[PDB]
Amino acid sequence: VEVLSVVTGEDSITQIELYLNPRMGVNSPDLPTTSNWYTYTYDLQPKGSSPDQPIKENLPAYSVARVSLPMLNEDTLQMWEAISVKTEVVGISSLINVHYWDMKRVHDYGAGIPVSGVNYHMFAIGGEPLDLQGLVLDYQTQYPKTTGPITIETVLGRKMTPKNQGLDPQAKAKLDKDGNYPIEVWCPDPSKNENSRYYGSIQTGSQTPTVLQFSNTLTTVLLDENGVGPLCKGDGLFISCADIVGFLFKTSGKMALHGLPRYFNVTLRKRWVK
Amino acid sequence: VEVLSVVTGEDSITQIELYLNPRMGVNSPDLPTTSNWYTYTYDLQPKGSSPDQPIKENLPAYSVARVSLPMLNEDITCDTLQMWEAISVKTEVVGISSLINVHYWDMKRVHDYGAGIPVSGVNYHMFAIGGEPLDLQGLVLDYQTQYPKTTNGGPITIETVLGRKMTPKNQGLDPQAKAKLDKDGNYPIEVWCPDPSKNENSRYYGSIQTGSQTPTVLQFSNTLTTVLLDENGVGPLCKGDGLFISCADIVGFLFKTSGKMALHGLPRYFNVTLRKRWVK
Amino acid sequence: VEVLSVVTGEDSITQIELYLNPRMGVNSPDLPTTSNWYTYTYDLQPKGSSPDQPIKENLPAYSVARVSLPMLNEDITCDTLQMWEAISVKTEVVGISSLINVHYWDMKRVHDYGAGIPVSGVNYHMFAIGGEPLDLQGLVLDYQTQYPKTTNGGPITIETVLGRKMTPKNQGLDPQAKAKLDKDGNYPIEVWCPDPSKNENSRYYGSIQTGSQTPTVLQFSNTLTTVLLDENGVGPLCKGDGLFISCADIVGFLFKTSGKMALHGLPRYFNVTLRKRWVK
Amino acid sequence: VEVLSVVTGEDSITQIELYLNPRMGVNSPDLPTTSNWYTYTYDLQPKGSSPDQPIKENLPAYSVARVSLPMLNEDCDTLQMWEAISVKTEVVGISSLINVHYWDMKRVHDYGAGIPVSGVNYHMFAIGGEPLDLQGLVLDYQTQYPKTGPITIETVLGRKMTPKNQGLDPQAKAKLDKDGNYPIEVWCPDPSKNENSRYYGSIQTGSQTPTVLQFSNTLTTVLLDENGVGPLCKGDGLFISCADIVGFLFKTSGKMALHGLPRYFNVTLRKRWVKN
Amino acid sequence: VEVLSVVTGEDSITQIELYLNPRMGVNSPDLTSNWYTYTYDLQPKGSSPDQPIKENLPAYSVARVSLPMLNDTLQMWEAISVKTEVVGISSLINVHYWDMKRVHDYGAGIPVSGVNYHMFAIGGEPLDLQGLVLDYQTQYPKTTGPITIETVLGRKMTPKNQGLDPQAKAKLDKDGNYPIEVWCPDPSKNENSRYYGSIQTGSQTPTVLQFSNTLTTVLLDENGVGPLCKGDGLFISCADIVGFLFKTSGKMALHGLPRYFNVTLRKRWVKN
Numbered sequence A: 001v002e003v004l005s006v007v008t009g010e011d012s013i014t015q016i017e018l019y020l021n022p023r024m025g026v027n028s029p030d031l032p033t034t035s036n037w038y039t040y041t042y043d044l045q046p047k048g049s050s051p052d053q054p055i056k057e058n059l060p061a062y063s064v065a066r067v068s069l070p071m072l073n074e075d076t077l078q079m080w081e082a083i084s085v086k087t088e089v090v091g092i093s094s095l096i097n098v099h100y101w102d103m104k105r106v107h108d109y110g111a112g113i114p115v116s117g118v119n120y121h122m123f124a125i126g127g128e129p130l131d132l133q134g135l136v137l138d139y140q141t142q143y144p145k146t147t148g149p150i151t152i153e154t155v156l157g158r159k160m161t162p163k164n165q166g167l168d169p170q171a172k173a174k175l176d177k178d179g180n181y182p183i184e185v186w187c188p189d190p191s192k193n194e195n196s197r198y199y200g201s202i203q204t205g206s207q208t209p210t211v212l213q214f215s216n217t218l219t220t221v222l223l224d225e226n227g228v229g230p231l232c233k234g235d236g237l238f239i240s241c242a243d244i245v246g247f248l249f250k251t252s253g254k255m256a257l258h259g260l261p262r263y264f265n266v267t268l269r270k271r272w273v274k
Numbered sequence B, C: 001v002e003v004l005s006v007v008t009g010e011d012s013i014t015q016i017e018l019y020l021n022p023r024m025g026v027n028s029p030d031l032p033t034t035s036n037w038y039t040y041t042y043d044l045q046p047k048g049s050s051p052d053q054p055i056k057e058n059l060p061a062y063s064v065a066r067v068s069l070p071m072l073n074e075d076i077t078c079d080t081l082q083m084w085e086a087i088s089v090k091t092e093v094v095g096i097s098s099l100i101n102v103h104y105w106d107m108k109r110v111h112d113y114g115a116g117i118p119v120s121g122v123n124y125h126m127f128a129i130g131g132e133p134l135d136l137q138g139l140v141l142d143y144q145t146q147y148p149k150t151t152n153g154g155p156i157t158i159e160t161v162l163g164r165k166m167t168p169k170n171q172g173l174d175p176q177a178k179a180k181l182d183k184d185g186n187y188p189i190e191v192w193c194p195d196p197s198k199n200e201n202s203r204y205y206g207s208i209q210t211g212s213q214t215p216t217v218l219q220f221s222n223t224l225t226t227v228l229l230d231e232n233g234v235g236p237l238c239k240g241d242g243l244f245i246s247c248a249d250i251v252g253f254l255f256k257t258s259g260k261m262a263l264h265g266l267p268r269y270f271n272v273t274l275r276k277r278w279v280k
Numbered sequence D: 001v002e003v004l005s006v007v008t009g010e011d012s013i014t015q016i017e018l019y020l021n022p023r024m025g026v027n028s029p030d031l032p033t034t035s036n037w038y039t040y041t042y043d044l045q046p047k048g049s050s051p052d053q054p055i056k057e058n059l060p061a062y063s064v065a066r067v068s069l070p071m072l073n074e075d076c077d078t079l080q081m082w083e084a085i086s087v088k089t090e091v092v093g094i095s096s097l098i099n100v101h102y103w104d105m106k107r108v109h110d111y112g113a114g115i116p117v118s119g120v121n122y123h124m125f126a127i128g129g130e131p132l133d134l135q136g137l138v139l140d141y142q143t144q145y146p147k148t149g150p151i152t153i154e155t156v157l158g159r160k161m162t163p164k165n166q167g168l169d170p171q172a173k174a175k176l177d178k179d180g181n182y183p184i185e186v187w188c189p190d191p192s193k194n195e196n197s198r199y200y201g202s203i204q205t206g207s208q209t210p211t212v213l214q215f216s217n218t219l220t221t222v223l224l225d226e227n228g229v230g231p232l233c234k235g236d237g238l239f240i241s242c243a244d245i246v247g248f249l250f251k252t253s254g255k256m257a258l259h260g261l262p263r264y265f266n267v268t269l270r271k272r273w274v275k276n
Numbered sequence E: 001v002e003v004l005s006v007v008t009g010e011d012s013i014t015q016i017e018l019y020l021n022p023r024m025g026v027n028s029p030d031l032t033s034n035w036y037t038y039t040y041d042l043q044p045k046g047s048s049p050d051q052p053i054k055e056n057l058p059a060y061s062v063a064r065v066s067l068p069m070l071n072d073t074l075q076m077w078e079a080i081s082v083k084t085e086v087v088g089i090s091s092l093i094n095v096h097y098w099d100m101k102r103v104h105d106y107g108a109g110i111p112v113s114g115v116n117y118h119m120f121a122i123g124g125e126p127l128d129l130q131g132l133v134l135d136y137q138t139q140y141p142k143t144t145g146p147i148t149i150e151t152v153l154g155r156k157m158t159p160k161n162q163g164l165d166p167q168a169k170a171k172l173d174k175d176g177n178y179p180i181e182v183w184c185p186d187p188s189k190n191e192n193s194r195y196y197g198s199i200q201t202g203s204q205t206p207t208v209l210q211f212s213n214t215l216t217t218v219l220l221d222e223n224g225v226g227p228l229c230k231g232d233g234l235f236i237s238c239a240d241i242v243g244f245l246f247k248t249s250g251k252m253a254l255h256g257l258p259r260y261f262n263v264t265l266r267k268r269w270v271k272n
């Protein structure tokens, strides 16, 4: 796909807006029986015996949407090119709440321990699904069958081996389904993703402060070193993210991970391609 | 709503000054018996049983003022009019030095015979400058929280705007959970955040810091200026000759001897520079 | 006060050097009995009953000096005069290296048989350069605090300036609670902060860090310069040929064996570059 | 070598990609007997009596590869060399560290989640036209490292360390020419050499210090020096080196093992004329 | 001394390389030397006075480098840039020192962490030092032997030495002899030196250090002039305390690392 000139003319620029709700394990608000924990995992707890058999509710997964863009070609073609994005984690202020009814206290008579600890923040803008690389802390982990999360065993069609604690070139997938690819199993593949831009960070520790910023004045430019943004194949724009904001500390000692939604406003332009 | 050229002339630039005192829950210094806790919450505690029924005094809220600006147009019926355009702001959290006090009479000690635990832990800092009220998005930690009813003197929360009880979706982004920041000390911080899908005509800047005893780390200087112009060189345009200024500055917990903890906020000062702009 | 052109000619630039020793509460090294605690407070403790009646030795205060500058105008009744304009400063906290000492005889050991807990915790750092005294705003953690009443002109607190008791509004920003930083070691840091609504003719820069054992993290280099010019390229103009220099540098607690804790301060050095400026 | 002009022409620029798996002590995934701990050390403990006699599985080492480049010269004292000009590099598998439910993970408190991988971090990478020059320096010169096996100061000196090896001993030098063989706690990059390499690193100590890492495919490191010259690949070999210790796995018993992650590289190179 | 033009010529630039080993208290590896690059155990006594031993007083490292001789108007070497690096940073991943205090039962050793102090200086003459101490009642060993404030004053310290006493001044002219806890760079002098430093206090505060051979520090002042080497001597000074070694008993010792320098100098015309 050879990249030609930017299309000149009236309706050459467009804007795409959307938000993605977090897929922490309880992924739907519409199941009365368990939806009270929507945007959280269940309780995360080392079993103390082998092997680990994590349940789907304890496996935060990436959020993804494919956005359909205005059709460009009737019959060398025009493609939408993503050039910038404004993105924001929404609901940050909710985390000042230190009086959840079942919050573990910092000490006797004190306030709740605020949401804190492990953070994981990433977003990606691309013209096709984000490429994923599989790597796990423990290859002996027995993830649930797709029946359900997509894990390394799913893509290999056989059990993990010790090499899956490192980089196994065969352990690859595409982020093509919302709330189905666990964060603990899949990371962005730096060996591919030529047609995506991704940005991420992690923070470990149990009670490490959650420190986050928000402003409507911040823009990320999506152009590469040659001045070309992601090109949207088949008029589809892929947007991916994850925003783990820390643990909810419960009175019993039990802890669950929590996530927040993310907002996007992407600017695109028409580009001639060969 | 076409933006035209900047107005040229002698009195084309004006400077507006204000301060906003914090609205942490005890929101008035003038109450008969309870005002000693002005700029603080009451004691924040998990109930231990469901549901949470938090009191007003435990719900820090946004500060907001509308500033009336000099009237610009002798004829309001014209297509082309002059509007005040906010171009920069100098803003400072006031009273930062007060937080070196480690000898509050009822302060929990760091250890036996030691000084008090200094104000520390949860921080939340934000300010916004707009030509109209700041747009808010509702999202809460726990949808089952029973906030005091607005009709009973309570704050404005999600149930208020929906006309019905929250559902689990309000733990995520619900597009119906929206409001405008149009009342000082009535929109709880733990319920409302700036709405990034709107606010075309505002600029906002904010941060959070969680943890229980996390150091409060703040700077102050009269040399720092925030430029309010967007990518096109246009600042917020003041509709009806009104400038909207919003903020929140939670600076941490006061740790009391018994173990009880209350949040504390500080005031914020603003000096906004505005210029006259022709608009169609 | 119309600012004209920078003066041209041979000796149009001058340099002013000084240092300011900290005023932590024990403010003199020349007292027979108590001067061992020079650069420290006494022991800081919550009283445990109301009200707090803090002693002067527990109230770190701002340092300040007024430097007399060379006289410039033979005839002071002329409309157009030369004034010294402060354009840049090199400033440094002195004695930072002294804080590696973890073997002070009465230092609390971190754990059994260990090294002393080093000077750490609450930090407060600020400096200002101005052509007049720094403008101060009063705000306190607790309005019920009973600060010392003296006959010797210090410490000056909100009650001192108001001529009446504080009220709850003094936990926020009370526009009547204002003062000028015109006396060395007399204005308590926990009561007074720089007033961002004034200070047009000064530049100030500060920060706080709370927490009990938070690392003290400081830099020093003789290569760092602060430019004092505002947006128009004008520095503070020295009224009456006087340069005002103010600062505070609390660097943390000395943790004593008994559990007691005292705040500690370090001195600050300044080298200010000034130029002659025509003003009308 | 005197550096002449950048070669002009159609195929004067090439790209090289590769990944390096971590060599934390259990260095192979292909030994059914012990490979379950691949990318970790064994349990790290003070012996409690002198001397320390660490096992190889407790000595994280540098990763290294020599990448063979296309042959440039059919020959003359004037020739072409590959010049590395930029690199995109990324630590892979960062997301794996959100796992706080490893079956034998020490809990933060009763009934809580596992203590996340945290504590000691050491991160470095190097790109060079020859092996990275190493300087030896150890915490304790009386440490008895396993005989070569890992290469340590005793190996290169052909005699026992002395106290001077707790500081900089100019005799304690090596070249990073073998994957997984040079212990990190013994060897660091030698700033007195490495004219033909570029290296970047950091350390973080503490026991439970947050592991804080970033990843983006938009970040490029420029490898040109102050004269606009990148590393020049002697004998058409490109040397890539790294280490990425990401913290401790805290086990239920109290035991602790260090953990590492792999690193990816995409290096851009151009043809450069050189003399001698 | 009037600074004239930069000398233009074939051999007008030179590079000076050196390293300085740390002087933490046990300052020689050629003796007790098992503790080279460390202090002895640092421990508040609990009773007065404090009479610290010389092995518990980390001191600045310094070298005078003799430069190639060049000569009212003469040439001087002018230091224009430096690449400097703390050596041996990787050694600090060792959490299995045989006598290391454990983080908890069955755990690894507490890594080297806590108090850090990092500084370097490049000058055309000795670094100017200012004396200031935590406690004027500290009784430092007599010079026979570190140089301290009592050494320079010729009389005991008074309370004023907890602040800035303009009489408490010295020149950093001897390696391993000027205690870090007594002396700091004098910002009121040092016109012909450039210095850079930081401190981090705390007991177990993470040691966070960087290393790269791509980082350069420009030594030129605001007028484009670097330090000028009087009598053809370049002064290089540093200190790099990297934290505590935590021992099983509870005792703690400070530890330092060496520092490497590569200084670029050029010839400069000057007038005396």
Ligand SMILES: CC(=O)N[C@H]1[C@H]([C@H](O)[C@H](O)CO)O[C@@](O[C@@H]2[C@@H](O)[C@H](O)O[C@H](CO)[C@@H]2O)(C(=O)O)C[C@@H]1O
Binding pocket: B037, B041, B042, B043, B256, B257, B258, B259, B260
């Ligand atoms: C928001 C507020 O005023 N909080 C008080 C708190 C309340 O008065 C509460 O309703 C009563 O506990 O009381 C605090 O002080 C306590 C005393 O009132 C009580 O008699 O004895 C307690 C210790 O045994 C304690 O001193 C509290 O609970 O900490 C103070 C707090 O500001």
Ligand SMILES: [Cl-]
Binding pocket: A119, A120, A121, A201, A202, A203
């Ligand atoms: Cl993160």
Ligand SMILES: [Cl-]
Binding pocket: B123, B124, B125, B207, B208, B209
């Ligand atoms: Cl914050």
Ligand SMILES: [Cl-]
Binding pocket: C123, C124, C125, C207, C208, C209
């Ligand atoms: Cl500070």
Ligand SMILES: [Cl-]
Binding pocket: D121, D122, D123, D202, D203, D204
């Ligand atoms: Cl690191």
Ligand SMILES: [Cl-]
Binding pocket: E116, E117, E118, E198, E199, E200
């Ligand atoms: Cl430091």
